[PDB]
Design an enzyme around this catalytic site. Structure first.
Site, PDB file in Angstrom:
ATOM      1  N   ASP A 132       0.818  -1.228   0.000  1.00  0.00           N
ATOM      2  CA  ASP A 132       0.000   0.000   0.000  1.00  0.00           C
ATOM      3  C   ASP A 132       0.850   1.276   0.000  1.00  0.00           C
ATOM      4  OD1 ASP A 132      -2.547  -1.477   0.389  1.00  0.00           O
ATOM      5  OD2 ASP A 132      -1.851  -1.648   2.508  1.00  0.00           O
TER       6      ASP A 132
ATOM      7  N   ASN B 154     -12.663  -6.088  10.776  1.00  0.00           N
ATOM      8  CA  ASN B 154     -13.674  -6.623   9.871  1.00  0.00           C
ATOM      9  C   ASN B 154     -13.124  -7.639   8.812  1.00  0.00           C
ATOM     10  OD1 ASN B 154     -12.380  -5.010   7.955  1.00  0.00           O
ATOM     11  ND2 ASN B 154     -14.229  -3.957   7.354  1.00  0.00           N
TER      12      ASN B 154
ATOM     13  N   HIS C 290     -10.637  -7.365   6.852  1.00  0.00           N
ATOM     14  CA  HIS C 290      -9.904  -6.718   5.727  1.00  0.00           C
ATOM     15  C   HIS C 290      -8.421  -7.110   5.737  1.00  0.00           C
ATOM     16  CE1 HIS C 290      -9.181  -3.264   8.631  1.00  0.00           C
ATOM     17  NE2 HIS C 290      -8.001  -3.282   8.032  1.00  0.00           N
TER      18      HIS C 290
ATOM     19  N   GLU D  41     -11.218  -4.217   1.431  1.00  0.00           N
ATOM     20  CA  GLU D  41     -12.320  -4.204   2.424  1.00  0.00           C
ATOM     21  C   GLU D  41     -13.319  -5.241   2.038  1.00  0.00           C
ATOM     22  OE1 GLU D  41     -13.739  -2.174   5.233  1.00  0.00           O
ATOM     23  OE2 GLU D  41     -11.602  -2.308   5.525  1.00  0.00           O
TER      24      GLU D  41
END
Ligand SMILES: N[C@@H]1[C@@H](O)[C@H](O)[C@@H](COP(=O)(O)O)O[C@@H]1O
EC number: 3.5.99.6
Length: 235
Positions: free
Chosen positions: A64, A130, A132, A137
């Site tokens: 990223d 969550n 991810h 996502e």
């Protein structure tokens, strides 16, 4: 096929195990590492920094970068990685997305090509609350390669605290996708604390669905999950 779990007392001990495993992969011929950001590998990084490991013939790849940030920006993942690892233990070559790319679609195509050119021997990962993975996502295609991600509002709000002006906060990232990440020969995923228990169980026990990005790891031929007692409560 398969996914081994190592359960550990706590983060410190999971980080020592991850270090030992990293050192073995390297001794057995690993040359390209995929790396993680966030809190999860911070103690694994301190250990590497203080160790006798030498990454000078090796290549690293990060997942990223924030769109709009340079490598010198204190808020960038390039800088995060410098602070926590590269300054002490540089690689032959360390890749991150160019957040300053003029043509975002060209940089995404470029990063895929670097992945093809330097396939990852060992990828270090954390997991989101969550489930991810990186910035991918729920709802992200399992087919996705490097792509432009709109950051969650929680992420923008969290990162906003670190910028004098609001017009300077990244709203987007250039991120390795799920198919990208799955290409590693070996994946080592680390998860510590109760906040990760639910995402961990869903990755291991739930169906393979784009709703749980980490559930694709169920299909990887060589995933090693290291989890402290609390994050592993569900498995
Ligand atoms: N910053 C992170 C990712 O890079 C990380 O793998 C995950 C968990 O973060 P942490 O390791 O801080 O719990 O979610 C965020 O998007």
């Amino acid at each position: 096929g398969s996914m081994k779990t190592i359960k550990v007392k706590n983060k410190t001990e999971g980080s020592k195990v991850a270090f030992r495993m990293l050192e073995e992969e390297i001794t057995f011929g690993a040359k390209t590492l995929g790396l993680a950001t966030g809190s999860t590998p911070l103690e694994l990084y301190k250990e590497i920094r203080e160790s006798h490991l030498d990454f000078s013939d090796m290549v690293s790849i990060n997942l990223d970068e924030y769109v709009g940030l340079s490598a010198d920006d204190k808020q960038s993942y390039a800088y995060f990685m410098k602070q926590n690892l590269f300054a002490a233990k540089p690689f032959k070559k360390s890749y991150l997305p160019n957040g300053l790319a003029a043509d975002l679609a060209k940089e995404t195509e470029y990063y895929d090509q670097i992945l093809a050119q330097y396939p990852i021997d060992l990828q270090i990962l954390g997991i989101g609350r969550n489930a991810h993975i990186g910035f991918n996502e729920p709802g992200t295609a399992f087919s996705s390669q490097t792509h432009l991600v709109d950051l969650t509002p929680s992420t923008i709000a969290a990162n906003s605290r670190f910028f004098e002006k609001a017009e300077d906060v990244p709203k987007q990232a250039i991120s390795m996708g799920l198919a990208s990440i799955m290409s590693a020969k070996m994946i080592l995923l680390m998860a510590f604390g109760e906040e990760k228990a639910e995402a961990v169980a869903a990755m291991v026990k739930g169906p393979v669905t784009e709703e749980i990005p980490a559930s694709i790891l169920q299909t990887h031929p060589k995933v090693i999950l290291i989890v402290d007692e609390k994050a592993g409560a569900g498995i």
